[PDB]
Amino acid sequence: FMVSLPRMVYPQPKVLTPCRKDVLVVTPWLAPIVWEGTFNIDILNEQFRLQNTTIGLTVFAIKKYVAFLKLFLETAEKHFMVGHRVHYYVFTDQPAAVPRVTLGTGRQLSVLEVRAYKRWQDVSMRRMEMISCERRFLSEVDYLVCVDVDMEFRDHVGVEILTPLFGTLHPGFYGSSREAFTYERRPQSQAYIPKDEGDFYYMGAFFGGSVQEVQRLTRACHQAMMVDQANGIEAVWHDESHLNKYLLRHKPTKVLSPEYLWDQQLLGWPAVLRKLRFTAVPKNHQ
Ligand SMILES: O=c1ccn([C@@H]2O[C@H](COP(=O)(O)OP(=O)(O)O)[C@@H](O)[C@H]2O)c(=O)[nH]1
Ligand SMILES: OC[C@H]1O[C@@H](O)[C@H](O)[C@@H](O)[C@H]1O
Ligand SMILES: [Mn+2]
């Protein structure tokens, strides 16, 4: 049950004036595409605080990537769901290497030890299995957000992203035609998408939704990756190829713009991005 919003004073939306004329702000299945200037964060904050919303954030920091946790977490504290209840879940093979970061009130961090895999690809790929922790998340949070660690928050990332299921536009492909997307193109893979299908190319580094929908998504991608393994095939972009196949067949209820996943070193700061909110930290491949 949702109680009434209080009286609020804010600018009137006018239907004969668009917030943004330069970009697509709604998908053809009527999911908002979240750009700056499309949302009044004061109204959204009210709606979500009146539900005492709790957001979980998953992050894997395996092997060398524990080095990225300090900046990731400290900048999350400045910009990620400030004012709301947050539970970080840090999955790592080195619990002792997790930095001691000071958290704002209403925020908590759990360290979950997991195995390390040798291959970069398996570390990245086995996140879906590890995420799909099912019973704990259902008891502890309302939404789950699943991100890469080799990142920093530079600006607001808040409850405008929350919805039953979201993906984020990959910053290399938002202006591309579908045939240029790097979907898995071999029909022998479960992640296969033909050249005439596809709405968007979503990046594997930022997706989320309600616990139920995120558990559906990660269970389906883990099952599909097991089928591929049994068939001796590995999708071209690993878990990201399977996330794309899932989101083509189960449309997300919001899509985040590339404000939410950017690389300023490789792509600069185009005018179409009013804010750069969550960005890659430089790293050697290797
Ligand atoms: O040795 C590794 C390799 C990958 N990852 C995790 O897998 C994610 C995706 O890998 P990566 O960031 O290397 O992929 P990229 O963004 O460079 O394509 C990383 O952010 C980490 O969360 C990790 O923890 N240790
Ligand atoms: O083509 C898709 C690829 O694009 C790269 O820019 C990115 O580093 C990879 O992780 C993958 O998303
Ligand atoms: Mn990454």
DSSP string computed for 170-189: -TTTTTS-GGGS-----TTS
Q: How was this structure determined?
A: X-ray
Distance between CA atoms of residues 231 and 233, nearest Å: 6
**Binding-site residues from annotation:** 60-62, 65, 148-150, 170, 182, 240, 263
The beta strand positions in 196-245, using DSSP E, are 206-210
CA separation, residue 212 to residues 97, 215, 281 (Å): 31, 5, 31
Question: In terms of DSSP bridges, do strands 85-92 and 54-61 run parallel, antiparallel, or are they unpaired?
Answer: parallel
Gap from CA of 67 to ligand 1 centroid (Å): 12
240 in catalytic set: yes
User: What resolution (Å)?
Assistant: 1.4
Closest ligand 1 atom to residue 120 Cα is: 3
Asked if 169 and 257 count as a contact pair (C-beta separation under 8 A), the reply is: yes
Closest ligand, as measured to the CA of 149: 1
Q: Which residue has the tokens 């950017």?
A: 262
Going from the N-terminus, what domains does the chain have, and what CATH number goes with each? 1-286 (3.90.550.10)
- Residue 183 alpha carbon to ligand 3 centre in Å: 18
